[PDB]
Design a protein around this nucleic acid. Structure first.
Ligand code: SF4
Ligand code: NA
Length: 348
DNA sequence: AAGACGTGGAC
DNA sequence: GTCCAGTCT
């Protein structure tokens, strides 16, 4: 019982007028669409634009990305967040090069088989680049649809998303699915804002149940996030006579996977506990700073300890000896990028 | 299902 | 402080 064409025409017409000239919107190349869509996951547009430009300059084609070293891609993603995204993407393009020859699959099931690609990305990439009419329901669309159709379901349950996707199937403009999908996302970004929605400027105010009932400001429905754990972290900054610095690569599974870091222990006696780990030859000074750094699911409480490094053997993996002049090359998390900043300030 | 998984911007 | 900008497991 939806005036689908009336809603479609107003939304699609409004999108052509208000469409932002974003970098990934210069064309409909799947690789560039695929890169932008992954980057945009849980990340604001304004944050992504520069990463996308540097990334695409370093990796202009799917084959360039697949052919690149794992550490080269991680550096390009340095500071963007959720780094498993890029590791999954780097693997996914490698599969596309070998399995599909470098042509991004146009089949939803085939593309959804690739790593890091879920329901939104299949809809987004395939609807825009190839025209496949698969729904592209992100958090923004779920808010838009929860207001257009007054849905109280918790948008957290995967099932609630499934309903919205089925809604998109029926209201979609199968005529131009790609333009229909990105119109919802652009509407969610520009008009149906998370707070203080501008429903008077909305091209689809008439077709919106929530605005009629006056409760758009009270949607979407979502459970309050669980409180995060607090994790004390002791961090060692170690220098030898020649100014080289001890850094180590984190394991490829779990938190900040394959990122380089200054050696640390989750000391829940920091200086002693740091000094025990290293033995498996150096001594530490008193702390110089303590600062916090937030994750989605926990908070690090860091404390930086300067120290001197005496070489009694080869610096074996995962550790590596890095001159100060070479640290700029490795990819560090923002947390340990701040460890270094505070360390050099203290040196001054 | 719900926790793991980064970082930054706007309230 | 809160909320927001998906996929794997
Ligand atoms: S009328 Fe208001 S609630 Fe409805 S889609 Fe537009 S901005 Fe969102
Ligand atoms: Na997948």
């Amino acid at each position: 019982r939806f005036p689908a064409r009336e809603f479609q025409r107003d939304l699609l017409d409004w999108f052509a007028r208000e469409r932002r000239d974003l970098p990934w919107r210069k064309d409909r190349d799947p690789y560039k669409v695929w890169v932008s869509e992954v980057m945009l996951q849980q990340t604001r547009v304004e944050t992504v634009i520069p990463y996308f430009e540097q990334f695409i300059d370093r990796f202009p084609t799917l084959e360039a990305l697949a052919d690149a070293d794992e550490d080269e891609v991680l550096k390009a993603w340095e500071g963007l967040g959720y780094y498993s995204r890029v590791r999954n993407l780097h693997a996914a393009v490698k599969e596309v090069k070998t399995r599909y020859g470098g042509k991004v699959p146009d089949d939803p099931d085939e593309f959804s088989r690739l790593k890091g690609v879920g329901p939104y990305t299949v809809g987004a990439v395939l609807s825009l680049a190839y025209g496949v009419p698969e729904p592209a329901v992100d958090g923004s669309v779920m808010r838009v649809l929860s207001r257009l159709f007054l849905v109280t379901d918790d948008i957290a349950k995967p099932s609630t998303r499934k309903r919205f996707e089925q809604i998109v199937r029926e209201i979609m403009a199968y005529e131009n699915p790609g333009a229909f999908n990105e119109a919802l996302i652009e509407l969610g970004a520009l008009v149906c804002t998370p707070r203080r929605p501008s429903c008077l400027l909305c091209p689809v105010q008439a077709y919106c149940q929530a605005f009629a009932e006056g409760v758009a400001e009270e949607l979407p429905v979502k459970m309050k996030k669980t409180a995060v754990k607090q994790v004390p972290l002791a961090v060692a900054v170690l220098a030898d006579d020649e100014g080289r610095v001890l850094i180590r690569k984190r394991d490829s599974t779990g938190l900040l996977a394959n990122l380089w870091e200054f050696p640390s222990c989750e000391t829940d006696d920091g200086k002693e506990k740091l000094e025990q780990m290293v033995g498996e030859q150096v001594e530490l000074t008193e702390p110089i700073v303590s600062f916090e750094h937030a994750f989605s699911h926990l908070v690090w409480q860091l404390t930086v300890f300067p120290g001197r490094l005496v070489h009694g053997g080869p610096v074996e993996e995962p550790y590596r000896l890095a001159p100060e002049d070479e640290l700029k090359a490795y990819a560090f998390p923002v947390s340990h990028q701040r460890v270094w900043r505070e360390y050099k300030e203290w040196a001054s």
